[PDB]
Design a binder for this molecule. Structure first.
Ligand SMILES: Nc1ncnc2[nH]cnc12
Length: 421
């Protein structure tokens, strides 16, 4: 299989190919391995000489594309590719993927979009199909460059600064109707509550183009230089990749990594203490806001010079509370993607989970009890105000049902905190 030079911003990293036998390989650029400021494209693909044939090569690149066959078919369609295989895919849109793995078979420009043209691109992304927000597996992610107060499409190899998500819509199941038509407002809101609570998350703005409302989340794998002259891409990978696992096992119930393996893995981070504290805090947070899709691919690390790594901010944060009620799901069905320790097993029922459960997990993970307590205690006295602040800071066209669905359910859980801290 032909080549596609792998680039990290403006540096040649290596080359990728494939074989007709069904195998895949990658090779590092000798001058890359010779630089003192070199670093592996993936922790699962250690810096080395000679092509790499391990499955980690395919998995890494295969984790760069949506794990949904439905979604891939669309891409393979509007782009015409041999098949759904990574290469054919990345050989078309690998110019602005996740991280800094720019692929290509002289720039610094873009193209502003009219409000009419903006609504044109967004609409380009959008029957009858263990609850998970991404069950429809029919949500195509896109990106756009934001210059000032305008939305533009990067021109050339120019990077994007925002990840764009359109409404998931209502999912029709045989015995249930999942109302995720307000997933944009959901995440927007959830990202504000997370920030207000001191969590490391990106900022997000709701795009208004025509009658379609979308979510624009700043990419933390990008960064403007001091003179706003160049927009740099930053190396990054998710837990599946770093562990050399396929996206098919991102969930723990499917054999994927849980809280234990990641916490242990973070002990080798350049910010071990901080990263373990933050990760653990996000678990309590997910529980509080009813975030059920905290799978392995929902956590990533920044690859730094020398092969050192550290936790990246948290992302794709969506509450399941808004989907509660009527013909939808019920609290009793809300389960964390990564279970906690139980008296004689695991706890995943957000409804049957209390402070004691998090404290029990910390102890076994060797996470300072005094820290777990501080996390529980900190939410106990900040949640009440946090909610109101977020609210009194929301637009006027923001749906009450969403805030009510989240706030109430949040205060309902937060009660178990105050009555202990
Ligand atoms: N905001 C973000 N920044 C970088 N990578 C992302 N992946 C998903 N959301 C992201």
């Amino acid at each position: 299989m032909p080549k596609l030079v792998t680039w990290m911003n403006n540096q040649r990293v290596g080359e990728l190919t494939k074989l007709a036998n069904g195998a895949h390989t990658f090779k590092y650029a000798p001058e890359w391995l010779a630089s003192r400021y070199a670093r592996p494209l993936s922790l699962s693909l250690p810096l080395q000489r000679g092509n790499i044939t391990s499955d980690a090569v395919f998995n890494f690149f295969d984790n760069l594309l949506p794990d949904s066959p439905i979604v891939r078919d669309r891409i393979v369609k509007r782009y015409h590719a041999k098949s759904r295989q990574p290469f054919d895919l990345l050989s078309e849109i690998g110019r602005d993927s996740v991280g800094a793995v720019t692929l290509i078979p002289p720039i610094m420009a873009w193209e502003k979009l009219t409000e009419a043209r903006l609504e044109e691109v967004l609409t380009a992304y959008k029957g009858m199909i263990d609850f998970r927000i991404s069950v429809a597996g029919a949500q195509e992610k896109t990106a756009l460059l934001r210059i000032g107060n305008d939305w533009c499409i990067p021109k050339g190899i120019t990077p994007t600064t925002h990840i764009i998500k359109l409404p998931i819509g209502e999912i029709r199941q045989p015995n249930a109707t999942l109302d995720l038509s307000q997933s944009v407002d959901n995440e927007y809101y959830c990202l504000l509550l997370a920030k207000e609570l001191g969590l490391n998350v990106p900022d997000a703005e709701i795009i208004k183009a025509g009658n379609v409302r979308a979510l624009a989340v700043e990419r933390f794998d990008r960064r403007w230089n001091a003179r706003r002259t160049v927009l740099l891409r930053l190396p990054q990978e998710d837990m599946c990749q770093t562990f050399g696992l396929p996206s098919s096992v991102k969930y723990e119930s499917d054999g994927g990594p849980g809280i234990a393996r990641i916490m242990a893995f973070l002990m080798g981070s350049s910010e071990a203490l901080k990263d373990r504290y933050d990760f653990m805090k996000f678990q309590v947070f997910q529980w509080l806001i009813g975030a059920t899709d905290g799978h392995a691919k929902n956590f990533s690390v920044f690859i730094q010079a020398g092969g050192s790594y550290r936790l990246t901010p948290f992302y794709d944060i969506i509450s399941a509370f808004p989907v509660l009620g009527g013909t939808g799901i019920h609290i009793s069905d809300l389960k964390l993607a990564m279970g906690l320790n139980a008296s004689k097993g695991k706890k995943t029922a957000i409804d049957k989970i209390y402070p004691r459960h998090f404290l029990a997990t910390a102890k076994v993970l060797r996470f300072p009890e005094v820290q777990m307590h501080e996390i529980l205690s900190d939410f106990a006295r900040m949640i009440p105000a946090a909610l109101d602040n977020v609210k009194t800071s929301l637009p006027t066209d923001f749906p009450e049902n969403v805030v009510t669905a989240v706030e109430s359910n949040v205060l309902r859980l937060h009660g178990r905190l105050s009555r202990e801290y």
